[PDB]
Amino acid sequence: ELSFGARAELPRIHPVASKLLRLMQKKETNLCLSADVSLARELLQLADALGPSICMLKTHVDILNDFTLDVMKELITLAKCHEFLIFENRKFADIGNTVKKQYEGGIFKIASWADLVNAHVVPGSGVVKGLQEVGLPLHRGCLLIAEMSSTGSLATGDYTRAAVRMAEEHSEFVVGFISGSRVSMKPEFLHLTPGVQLEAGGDNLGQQYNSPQEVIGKRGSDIIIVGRGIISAADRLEAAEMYRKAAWEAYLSRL
Amino acid sequence: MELSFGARAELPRIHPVASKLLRLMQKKETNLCLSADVSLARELLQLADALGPSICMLKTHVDILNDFTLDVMKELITLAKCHEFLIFENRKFADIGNTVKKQYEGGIFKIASWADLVNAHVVPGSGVVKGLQEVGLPLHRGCLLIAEMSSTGSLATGDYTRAAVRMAEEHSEFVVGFISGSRVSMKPEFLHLTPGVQLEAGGDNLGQQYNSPQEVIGKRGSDIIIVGRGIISAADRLEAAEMYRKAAWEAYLSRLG
Ligand SMILES: O=C(O)c1cc(=O)[nH]c(=O)n1[C@@H]1O[C@H](COP(=O)(O)O)[C@@H](O)[C@H]1O
Numbered sequence: 427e428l429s430f431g432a433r434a435e436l437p438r439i440h441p442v443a444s445k446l447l448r449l450m451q452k453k454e455t456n457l458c459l460s461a462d463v464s465l466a467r468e469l470l471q472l473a474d475a476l477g478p479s480i481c482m483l484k485t486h487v488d489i490l491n492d493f494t495l496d497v498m499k500e501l502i503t504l505a506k507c508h509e510f511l512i513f514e515n516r517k518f519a520d521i522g523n524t525v526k527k528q529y530e531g532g533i534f535k536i537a538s539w540a541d542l543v544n545a546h547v548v549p550g551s552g553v554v555k556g557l558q559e560v561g562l563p564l565h566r567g568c569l570l571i572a573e574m575s576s577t578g579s580l581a582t583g584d585y586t587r588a589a590v591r592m593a594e595e596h597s598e599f600v601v602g603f604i605s606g607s608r609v610s611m612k613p614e615f616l617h618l619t620p621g622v623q624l625e626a627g628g629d630n631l632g633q634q635y636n637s638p639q640e641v642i643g644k645r646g647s648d649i650i651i652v653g654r655g656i657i658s659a660a661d662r663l664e665a666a667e668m669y670r671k672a673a674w675e676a677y678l679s680r681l
Numbered sequence: 682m683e684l685s686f687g688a689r690a691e692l693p694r695i696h697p698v699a700s701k702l703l704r705l706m707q708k709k710e711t712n713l714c715l716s717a718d719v720s721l722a723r724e725l726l727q728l729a730d731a732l733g734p735s736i737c738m739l740k741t742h743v744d745i746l747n748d749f750t751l752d753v754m755k756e757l758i759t760l761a762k763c764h765e766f767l768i769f770e771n772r773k774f775a776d777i778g779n780t781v782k783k784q785y786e787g788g789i790f791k792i793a794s795w796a797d798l799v800n801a802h803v804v805p806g807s808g809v810v811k812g813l814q815e816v817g818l819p820l821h822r823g824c825l826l827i828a829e830m831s832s833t834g835s836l837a838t839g840d841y842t843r844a845a846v847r848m849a850e851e852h853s854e855f856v857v858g859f860i861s862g863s864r865v866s867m868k869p870e871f872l873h874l875t876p877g878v879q880l881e882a883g884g885d886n887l888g889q890q891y892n893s894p895q896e897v898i899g900k901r902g903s904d905i906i907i908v909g910r911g912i913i914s915a916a917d918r919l920e921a922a923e924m925y926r927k928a929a930w931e932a933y934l935s936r937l938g
């Protein structure tokens with residue numbers, strides 16, 4: 427088991443992964459905030475106030491009612507100031523020819539501002555080869571969805587193994603996984619885990635929660651992704667700190 | 682028994698959106714869905730106007746449309762009503778239920794406001810359908826589940842495809858069919874829509890694989906062909922659409938008997 431700082435220096439490490447691992451060690455946070463808010467002002471307010479506490483901010487551009495590329499310019503400034511990466515939520519999950527345009531184009535131009543994107547592996551490896559065409563020139567990274575947190579997920583067994591092989595064979599662009607646990611034994615890959623709350627439970631639409639201790643400590647993942655656990659709290663600053671402190675200590679303990 | 686689209690439109694358990702589709706298919710003799718992955722609204726609208734009479738559906742790619750406004754979608758709706766086709770947005774809904782409802786309803790695009798049909802990947806489990814349904818049900822919208830894919834290395838096989846079929850059958854108030862390479866359900870109320878179709882053999886350099894209208898409709902038992910590059914790359918996109926329409930329509934007539 428290597429520290430985040432050491433992993434950032436691995437020969438085969440991807441630049442985006444290195445930058446992330448560095449800032450994680452520096453700031454003592456392996457917490458990614460999921461900010462699914464409908465107003466640009468809310469997104470920017472949250473990112474400024476919680477920026478110190480997070481390694482990464484998961485955006486949801488598809489639901490921002492007043493998206494503009496200027497908002498993203500401003501977000502990037504915050505990102506650079508507080509030191510966190512930007513991970514857009516959009517689930518790329520089409521054939522390679524189509525995902526390329528989805529990633530680069532349209533009103534959102536996701537590749538022009540997102541350090542990280544995620545893709546589903548269901549279409550086969552063409553999904554990654556397509557993204558890569560746009561992502562590599564722009565010096566970007568990609569996470570593959572190897573497992574999901576929701577009830578009835580089909581991202582199990584051979585599907586998960588297929589995800590891991592895909593990542594390992596496209597390591598110039600793929601830097602990690604969305605998963606519920608460690609799924610790759612190569613320490614160059616990041617594991618990011620959604621479906622995280624301090625308390626037991628779920629939501630009324632299939633979400634299932636596990637704690638930071640369970641996911642980071644017992645299941646060997648690297649980063650927790652938390653949305654409602656923080657956003658719905660009365661004091662969001664305090665919430666983000668509780669989740670950061672939880673995940674960080676689980677990591678240290680594993681070391 | 683094989684039934685005509687017109688007959689299927691009258692099936693007891695048929696969804697209103699499926700029935701509207703099936704009836705215009707029969708009336709217009711077309712089971713062709715144009716995939717218009719273009720970056721400009723003028724091209725989209727010009728294609729929708731010129732090919733409108735030849736298609737039963739238009740697959741939009743709003744994420745790629747550089748000059749999207751809701752007013753463009755307003756004009757598309759006009760053309761869809763005039764020429765009689767449904768609007769099917771390509772966006773792959775593939776998140777947990779709570780998240781997909783906002784993606785469908787909201788943001789700048791407000792996809793549920795103008796799309797007759799959406800598609801979802803089934804990998805998140807049935808939550809993905811429940812979330813979409815909370816928005817789309819009152820709007821008489823329908824959902825297609827992605828049961829199989831046309832690309833090399835597709836994981837939508839075996840138990841995965843079966844899970845897709847079961848999910849649709851258990852949510853038939855909202856799920857109206859499949860994206861698939863063949864008939865995957867025996868229930869005639871469900872539509873089968875097949876991408877990866879060109880008149881000529883081949884593929885692309887990023888994993889796409891093609892089969893002909895004759896194969897997919899006639900031998901594999903699908904209902905509708907989805908075609909992008911086969912039409913969009915032609916000099917004459919109207920001529921090309923007519924060729925695909927006649928191919929798919931005759932293939933359907935063949936298995937009808
Ligand atoms: O991409 C993800 O992180 C995602 C996949 C998954 O398997 N589970 C999952 O919860 N998500 C997303 O992670 C976030 C979890 O948010 P909360 O449940 O509010 O903490 C939401 O944006 C989900 O859409």
Ligand SMILES: O=C(O)c1cc(=O)[nH]c(=O)n1[C@@H]1O[C@H](COP(=O)(O)O)[C@@H](O)[C@H]1O
Pocket residue numbers: 520521524716718771800829830831832860876877878889907908909910911
């Ligand atoms: O969502 C789809 O229809 C999709 C699934 C699939 O398995 N295969 C597939 O080709 N598609 C889409 O269908 C269209 C095919 O385009 P052409 O390959 O240009 O005919 C594109 O919009 C693809 O993204």
